Amino acid sequence: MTRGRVIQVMGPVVDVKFENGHLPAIYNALKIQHKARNENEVDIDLTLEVALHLGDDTVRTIAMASTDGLIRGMEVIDTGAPISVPVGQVTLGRVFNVLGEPIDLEGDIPADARRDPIHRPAPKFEELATEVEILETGIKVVDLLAPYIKGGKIGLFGGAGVGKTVLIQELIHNIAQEHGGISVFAGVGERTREGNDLYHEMKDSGVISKTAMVFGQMNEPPGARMRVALTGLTMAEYFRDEQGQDGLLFIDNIFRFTQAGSEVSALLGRMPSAIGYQPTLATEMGQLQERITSTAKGSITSIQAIYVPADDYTDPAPATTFSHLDATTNLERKLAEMGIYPAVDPLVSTSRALAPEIVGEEHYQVARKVQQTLERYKELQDIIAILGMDELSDEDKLVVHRARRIQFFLSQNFHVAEQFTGQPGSYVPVKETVRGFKEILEGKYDHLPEDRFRLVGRIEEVVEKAKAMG
């Protein structure tokens, strides 16, 4: 029948030979379920993804778990389809591995469950949405200075005591609310310790009921770490496709995705390319990234956390990645120290979308201005700490004045912050966001004490904040 047998085992790479010219196609799943026939063997249960057809009825395969215990001769079975995984409400509030098995303790998914193959061609040209429409996150800094695009790819930079988890959490919340969109979180090769923390942080923030999670952590063989982004992608695709939602896809450390790729490539016997990477780098990225988009129905927006190989951004992996990014969100451990949370750098965070052709003069004009006024203030500091604030070229003081209100007005009440602040949380829409900064720039609030625009929402709240200590 469609039964192959193990021929070789080179670490995670396993070759299987199939009789009767059955030959499973590329990307098909192969289960090895062996029970030890004696005390000199071990019980095996392993899925292998077919990688190539080497000839002589042999397929080189990449195992999704550890190959310890394999014995040349073990029989392999062809599932007929690529690694398929549960999609739907059933995945929400739950954590799973690459294979699609839950790894939380809430019991197992039913066999009735729909399961989609992780490998699938991206939307057809005719199927994509034509107009570039910005996705509103109700977060000032974001929506003004580095507008996220519905379906694009945002690079999240910064992630050590800067509020990276709060921002993700606050995002999963707003979209789920004001947009009715589920989020999906894919952890790719990056500290189990952290995966645990975030999961729990999601219990308390309560945002976990609006998010399915997949972890293919740092202890996973190359195959596991490489495919988890596809699993979590599929689970998310079901909403955009079937339930036309504008959902989210968080991938924590996509770099580990490519690293996992090269780690396998070498083992398959591929000619190393630049910096020992796989000759296949670009292609593997594009195939993952081209599914993340807005079709006629819904959309998939991804916020990929990027962690470059020791400060270097010219390294193949990230070099490749940036070619797909539509915006960058840089969280800085400076604005955070000042207490300006979200610590989203208003001058480094950039967007392909801050163009009047998309946001109009109203938004754009105000934006480049907030970015410019901050320029003066940023460069003056050195002059400040030397000659003081005394008589700083009239207008320049006017800027140092207005600026300080501006950078402060950029912080916000995160709904997930109430957990420990008391303040409920905001959701300022870009329309009100622009206005707030519009009037501020007009100096129409130059008579208020800094802390008045501190940690609020619209510009109204600043006035309400006024009737407190002044």
């Binding site: 190539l52 057809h53 991206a122 000619m271 390319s273 990234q289």
Partner: protein, 479 residues
């Protein structure tokens, strides 16, 4: 040599878009073969006991044993008029979904480039409509002007506006986005439709998702389709949205075949890969009906490193390069043109006299201004005079996306600021003065612009008149 294995093979290995098949005894290297599942493939390596086939589509439907049949056609692509306004993959198969492409003639992908004698010097310019470029970095029909810069420097847009500005002129634009995102491709082809451009544009697409082979081929299928009109009296402009992505796809396909790498993993024939490609952009002799295929190669620079391998290669081929500055973009200067490094060689014999006279001083006014300012935070009194219009020039060069400006009214504005007719108005109202002066001229000067146009010159009547005519507006402008 007829029916048997001579025309039929069997797959031995399928994988990573490549395949090796036994048989196919009569295939010609370069021949498009067809797999049973109906996917096409090109035979690259004719080895003694197997054939190296590069698959041009989905390689998962193919398994060992699959039959592979000869077609008897060297890799070719459908060429014709029916392609205009269509969005097709590198194989001429439409992907926009407007139905089949009813083409009759066909052309081979890899073809010989015009000879040393088959050519004639470029002289007819190519009006990009993008101010900074037509005056400072002229492009002539049959030239290859590399436009290089970092991601998000506005390289795609420049070629877009340039294409939009080809409704007046007789140009058959061709946009070949290699390695780009289908999403971006869709939005581009959609803004083209808006500006009534697919009436003269074909769009070949090889998105990030498609297998390397297609990206590798895309530029060539592009030149082919364009060669048709060119080598037939017509004028063609070909834009390749990313040669870095092609190079990279090539590198991938190369190592996959285990061809020994060369520098930076890049095969030994990486340069020739591009050279042979851009040698096809020529300016045919009148003896051959002076057709012209202009080429606009894109090269994405990581961190603005020009010195890189692939960028230096493609620079040593093209007739000059347009440099888009990264910082220039984000601070707010569209087009992010970095005048200094930017250079056009055939540039000169392209411009119409109107542009020739005025644009001359522009380089200097900009030159001085450039060297006067890392010293961000003061300088000579003569320099305080130079900074005057120099600061205003920068405001006139800056242009708004999707708004192509015709030469006639363009030579006048480039005139004003170089003849002081703008120095009285602050940078704050320079761009306003522009929109202003334009519509004013379109009305009052609607008899003057025609002089710039029809003659392509601006001698006495034009210089004297326009001098006092600029006053007609400046001496009627708001504050």
């Amino acid at each position: 040599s007829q029916i048997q294995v001579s025309d039929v093979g069997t797959v031995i290995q399928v994988g990573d878009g490549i395949a090796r098949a036994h048989g196919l005894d009569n295939v010609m290297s370069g021949e498009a073969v067809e797999f049973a599942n109906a996917v096409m493939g090109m035979a690259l390596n004719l080895e003694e006991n197997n054939v190296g086939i590069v698959i041009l589509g989905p390689y998962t439907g193919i398994k060992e044993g699959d039959e592979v049949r000869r077609t008897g056609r060297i890799m070719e692509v459908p060429v014709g008029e029916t392609l205009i306004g269509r969005v097709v993959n590198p194989l001429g198969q439409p992907v926009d979904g407007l139905g089949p492409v009813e083409t009759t003639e066909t052309r081979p992908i890899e073809s010989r480039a015009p000879g040393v004698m088959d050519r004639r010097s470029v002289h007819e310019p190519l009006q990009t409509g993008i101010k900074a470029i037509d005056a400072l970095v002229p492009i002539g029909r049959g030239q290859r002007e590399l436009i290089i810069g970092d991601r998000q420097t506005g390289k795609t847009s420049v070629a877009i506006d340039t294409i939009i500005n080809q409704k007046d002129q007789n140009m058959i634009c061709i946009y070949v986005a290699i390695g780009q995102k289908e999403s971006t491709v869709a939005t581009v082809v959609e803004t083209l439709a808006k500006h009534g451009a697919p009436d003269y544009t074909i769009v070949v697409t090889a998105s990030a998702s498609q297998p390397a082979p297609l990206l590798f081929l895309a530029p060539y299928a592009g030149v082919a389709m364009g060669e048709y009109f060119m080598i037939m009296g017509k004028h063609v402009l070909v834009v390749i949205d990313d040669l870095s992505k092609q190079a990279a796809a090539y590198r991938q396909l190369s190592l996959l075949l285990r061809r020994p790498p060369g520098r930076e993993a890049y095969p030994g024939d990486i340069f020739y890969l591009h050279s042979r490609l851009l040698e096809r952009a020529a300016k045919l002799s009148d003896a051959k009906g002076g057709g012209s295929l202009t080429a606009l190669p894109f090269v994405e620079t990581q961190a603005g490193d020009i010195s890189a391998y692939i960028p230096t290669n493609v620079i040593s081929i093209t007739d000059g390069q347009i440099f888009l500055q990264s910082d220039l973009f984000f601070s707010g200067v569209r087009p992010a043109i970095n005048a200094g490094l930017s250079v056009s060689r055939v540039g000169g014999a392209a411009q119409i006299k109107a542009m020739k006279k005025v644009a001359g001083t522009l380089r200097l006014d900009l030159a001085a201004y450039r060297e006067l300012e890392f010293a961000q935070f003061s300088d000579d009194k003569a320099t305080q005079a130079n900074v005057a219009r120099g600061a205003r020039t920068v405001e006139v060069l800056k242009q708004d996306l999707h708004q192509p400006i015709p030469v006639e009214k363009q030579v006048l504005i480039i005139y004003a600021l170089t003849r002081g007719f703008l120095d009285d108005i602050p940078v704050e109202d320079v761009r306003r003065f522009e929109k202003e002066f334009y519509l004013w001229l379109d009305q009052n000067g609607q008899h003057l612009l025609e002089h710039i146009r029809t003659t392509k010159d601006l001698p006495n009547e034009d210089d004297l008149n326009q001098a006092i005519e600029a006053f007609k507006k400046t001496f009627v402008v708001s504050q």
